[PDB]
């Protein structure tokens, strides 16, 4: 018997560079037995969502706005930005076809080495 993952989205950290400044999410991710770490942005997620609305269209993925008129790093906003992005995924990985999907796979790390 194969392990259905699950995962969650429990923080998020701000990283800065030069003028630059990006909110890191950190994924939990667990399949049976054993749990990693991934980190992810709010775009890596919105490429996922992009690629997957298209090819199953009768799912109605949802994922929180891309675009916000005001601050980016209202620590509210993003709050609520990665209740939005949990809810994603974790409705993601219900759909074994889904977990099976070459891009999220490799979006949760699940066939690494890293992890064995």
Same mark, same amino acid.
């Given at each position: ?16 560079? %030069? %003028? ?5 999410? @950190? ?7 054993? &749990?990693? /770490? ?8 919105? @490429? ?15 994922? =929180?706005? @891309?675009?916000? /008129?005001?601050?980016? /790093?209202?620590?509210? /906003?993003? %709050?609520?930005? +990665?209740?939005?992005?949990? &809810? ?7 759909? =074994? ?15 690494? =080495? +890293?992890?064995?």
């Amino acid at each position: 018997k194969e392990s259905c993952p699950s995962v969650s989205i429990p923080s998020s950290d701000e990283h800065r560079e %030069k %003028k630059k400044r990006f909110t890191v999410y @950190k994924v939990l991710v667990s399949v049976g037995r054993s &749990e990693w /770490f991934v980190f992810r942005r709010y775009a890596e997620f919105d @490429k996922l969502y992009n690629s997957l609305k298209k090819q199953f269209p009768a799912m109605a993925l949802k994922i =929180p706005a @891309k675009r916000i /008129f005001g601050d980016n /790093f209202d620590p509210d /906003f993003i %709050k609520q930005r +990665r209740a939005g992005l949990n &809810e994603f995924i974790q409705n993601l990985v219900r759909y =074994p076809e889904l977990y099976n999907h070459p891009d999220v796979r490799a979006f949760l790390q699940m066939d690494s =080495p +890293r992890h064995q």
